[PDB]
Design a binder for this molecule. Sequence first.
Ligand SMILES: [Ca+2]
Ligand SMILES: [Cl-]
Length: 416
Amino acid sequence: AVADDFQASVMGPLAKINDWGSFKKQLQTLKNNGVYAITTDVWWGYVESAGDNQFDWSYYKTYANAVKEAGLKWVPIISTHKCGGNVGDDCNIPLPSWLSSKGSADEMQFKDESGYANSEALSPLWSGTGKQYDELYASFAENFAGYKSIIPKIYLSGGPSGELRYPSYYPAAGWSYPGRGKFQAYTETAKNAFRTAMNDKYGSLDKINAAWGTKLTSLSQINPPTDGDGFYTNGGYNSAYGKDFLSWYQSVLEKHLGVIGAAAHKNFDSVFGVRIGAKISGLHWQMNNPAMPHGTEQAGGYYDYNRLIQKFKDADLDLTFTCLEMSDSGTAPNYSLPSTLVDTVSSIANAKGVRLNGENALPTGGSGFQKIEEKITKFGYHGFTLLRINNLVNNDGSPTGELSGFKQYIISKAKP
Ligand SMILES: [Ca+2]
Ligand SMILES: [Cl-]
């Protein structure tokens, strides 16, 4: 069964609201169907665009006012990531542009196996990332304290697309599905952080060689994989070196979760006092590829789900997972097993007492709702958020054909 406190929420639209009357009609219809809350990307690029610590919350106060007036709860996602920004993308909401003048690009960004630089979110390795998020959370808390009664939960963005991961798969870097993507530790800052991490762990270059079986003559010859595709088949993954690299690669995300979690708790616990959550990506493809098993997950930063989910527990953050609507396939060439992935992550979270919340990866309907229903009831989910509002209600406020199924399968699980 779903958890005793289960509620169904719906993600708001991607595009900035420019017709408030239309959005209000949509909100009324969702409320009339028993929807609990609206989840909302609160874009960093919208709210601190003019300068460091120069805030503009007015659009989101309007947004929150509309949600409140419709009798809905509001679940803000503090979205410290970029939306699109490449020609043809369906949004263009970059990080605040002044950030570029505050630290070195190398320390602030991600670089892939081929040298492609990605700026979808600030690197956890930048000294200024934690400080910037702390200021932003403080500002949110200060500006939205008067909205306490309508905010039941707050989400953090742990990286690209609001997910705690590396920007490992990116169309503008040459990626297309079902590519495993690429490791994202090729900035000098990342390479040096890995060298420093290994020197700290083993104590010297010679002790690193002792652990790895290598014959390096300087720390500067230590690098991330210089060929990611064959990282399993070439003995990389199974090697002491490969395990050290992947563990470290994941540890960067884990420390980041700790930092942003602590900043969120510090700013929110005495103002809102609600559950705070973050999201793990559903990297469901290349799971069972014989030549690169779990290659997509690994490039994204996922080496050990037990340990990663333990960090959620330690940081006292709830876990949102995705792909709840998808079925297992496992066939070449996609090697995609999202339903098994959901079971894996969900089972681990429940074993640890980490509260689960769910989302669909892609717009869905029909059988998608029955799959979501299976997951939320098998694993005692505390919430489900449907992406997105226009898949349930048209601009004029009329239901799509899917609202009925969403209501019958999902909303009906909630106590009103
Ligand atoms: Ca700031
Ligand atoms: Cl946009």
